[PDB]
């Protein structure tokens, strides 16, 4: 029984989010594109490095924000940067949020020489979409 991204039903009480409540084949029907880069063209280079950077930054932002993420991230690319659209969960105080954001921005700028400025979207309750 294949079980890629589709979640197996068990009881109608699974508080699943919006993005998490979508099969892995609806990328061209219902589900959109999270990360984007020219590496997945026919055909342009710069693909392996972009995918590695995306997979690394995802875990980085998820670790720096322990539990303060309502759902998965939505990476982007505009210039020599990598915008990250996230649905932050109202957990810590705004002062701590600003401090951590500034610290992470400065650290990334001085580490990768690329100002990876992110974006937040504070939401208290998780965006439950279905009860699988």
């Amino acid at each position: 029984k294949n079980r890629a991204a589709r979640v197996r039903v068990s009881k109608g009480d699974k508080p699943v989010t919006y993005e998490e409540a979508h099969a892995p084949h609806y990328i061209a029907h219902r589900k959109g594109w999270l990360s984007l880069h020219t590496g997945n063209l026919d055909g342009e280079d710069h693909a392996a490095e972009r995918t590695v950077e995306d997979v690394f930054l995802r875990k980085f932002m998820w670790g720096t924000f322990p539990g303060c993420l309502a759902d998965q991230l939505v990476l982007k690319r505009r210039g020599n940067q990598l915008e990250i659209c996230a649905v932050v969960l109202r957990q810590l105080s705004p002062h701590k949020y600003y401090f951590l954001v500034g610290y992470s921005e400065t650290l990334l700028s001085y580490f990768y020489k690329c100002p990876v400025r992110l974006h937040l979207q504070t939401v208290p309750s998780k965006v439950v979409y279905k009860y699988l």
């Binding site: 690394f56 875990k59 322990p66 539990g67 810590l92 002062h95 701590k96 401090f99």
Partner: protein, 322 residues
């Protein structure tokens, strides 16, 4: 390496294996001994840049480990669980009262009391032996308001609350005379469970099944002798007891039907007779047909108790308290 890094919930699920979080690691205070204007100092009011020695950071880590150990110890805190009838079992155990209704009906006055628990294993087409559970709960505070119910399911708390709701929707009433003893004796034969009850006064003691003891405590009866004859089937015994309690001849109704008063010569008091019930209109002036040597099919146990002929290694021995 970095490629060997992933989430933590997945690793936890894998380590647990049941098929077939950063509390101690603070996020605000830097894990390296350092001071900053942000936190650990007056919240922006001496805002400077300092650094703590590595020994101080090691001490902070040891304090966090001690806090983790204290939390683990708190997790080991024991609790009190009243033993129902049998040790470590849900025999005569009690729980919270039933929940109210939608519009109201404050049923919190009644008290719940789980009786028996049974794990039924029934095979299926593919799921196999279904671990189904059947429970029989009896709810009721007293004053006649009570009633049994049933609630079978593959769960515990769900089945308990289902049985509680069923009992709330199935409230039985029993006509009583002075909350202490039943009207008269009953000699029923429910299917295969015999019930031989005997009218006894107050302060006599509860000489009946523990389930029957709990049923009486919930109903209101204080003490009453009962010979649990025949097989010991919880469900059938309770059903027969309920049927007998529902089929009883009261005093007022009997007097209104027959007419004659209730004559009695209590031994505790004097010969002064005190009527217990009187008719609601007429009065049969003629007396009952005092036909001696009647045909009252008494039980052999009655004769054995009256003549003291009963003897065994467990006749009438001292029982527990409460």
């Amino acid at each position: 390496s970095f490629f060997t890094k992933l989430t933590a919930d997945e690793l936890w699920k894998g380590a647990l294996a049941e098929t077939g979080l950063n509390r101690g690691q603070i996020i605000g205070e830097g894990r390296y001994g350092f001071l900053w204007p942000g936190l650990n100092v007056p919240l922006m009011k001496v805002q400077t840049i300092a650094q703590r020695s590595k020994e101080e950071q090691e001490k902070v880590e040891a304090d966090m480990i001690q806090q983790r150990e204290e939390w683990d110890r708190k997790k080991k805190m024991k609790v009190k669980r009243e033993r129902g009838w049998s040790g470590n079992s849900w025999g005569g155990i009690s729980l919270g009262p039933p929940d109210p209704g939608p519009c109201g009906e404050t049923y919190e006055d009644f008290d719940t009391r789980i009786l028996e628990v049974r794990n039924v294993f029934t095979m299926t087409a593919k799921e196999g032996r279904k671990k189904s559970i059947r429970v029989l709960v009896a709810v009721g505070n007293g004053k006649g308001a009570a009633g049994f119910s049933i609630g079978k399911a593959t769960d515990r708390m769900d089945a308990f609350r289902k049985a509680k709701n069923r009992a709330v929707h199935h409230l039985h009433y029993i006509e009583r005379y002075e909350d202490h003893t039943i009207f008269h004796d009953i000699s029923l034969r429910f299917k295969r469970t015999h019930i031989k009850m005997k009218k006894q006064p107050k302060g006599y003691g509860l000489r009946c099944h523990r389930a029957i003891i709990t049923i009486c405590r919930l109903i209101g009866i204080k003490d009453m002798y009962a010979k649990v004859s025949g097989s010991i089937n919880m469900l059938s015994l309770t059903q027969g007891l309920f049927r007998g309690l529902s089929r009883q001849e009261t005093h007022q109704q009997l007097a209104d039907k027959k007419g004659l008063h209730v004559v009695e010569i209590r031994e505790e008091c004097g010969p002064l007779p005190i009527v217990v019930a009187s008719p609601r209109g007429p009065l049969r002036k003629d007396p009952e047909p005092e036909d001696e040597v009647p045909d009252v099919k008494l039980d052999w146990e009655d004769v054995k108790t009256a003549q003291g002929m009963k003897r065994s290694v467990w006749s009438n021995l001292k029982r527990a308290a409460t």
